[PDB]
Amino acid sequence: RNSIRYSELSPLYDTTKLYLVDNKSADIASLNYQNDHSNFLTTVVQNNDFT
Amino acid sequence: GVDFTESRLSNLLGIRKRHPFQEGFKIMYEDLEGGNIPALLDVTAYEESKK
């Protein structure tokens, strides 16, 4: 029951929010050559350490 | 011509890129093809003319 923890709050359960943006700064350039605002794609992962 | 890239007023001018996600977006004399103003007709020249 060894357990190395610290801050970085337990990937938590019970309900959170999912932000589904579209003009988030990186999404654009990697993915929005393909089209408009009627359809696009978005990283729902809000970690900036990721393309 | 006129480049908006660095601005939003575009959205005010009710004019916007069709792939709203890049930058080929400036408008030059060269793009508005056929869209030349007609020229306008001379009224007085038409009038006096009954020779």
DSSP A1-50: ------SS--S--S-------S--HHHHHHHTTS--SSS--------TT-
Q: How far is CA B18 from the centre of its chain?
A: 17
**Which parts of B are annotated binding residues for Zn(2+)?**
19
Q: Nominal resolution in Å? A: 3.8
Residue from A29, A40, A37 nearest B11 by CA: A37
Query: A42 and chain B: CB distance < 8 Å anywhere?
Result: no
Cα–Cα distance measured from residue A50 to residue A41, given in angstroms and rounded to the nearest whole number: 15
The technique by which this structure was obtained is X-ray
Chain B partners within 8 Å of A36 (Cβ): 18-21
Which amino acid belongs to residue A4? I
- Phi/psi at A2 (5° precision): -70, 140
Is A29 within 8 Å of B18 when comparing Cβ atoms?
no
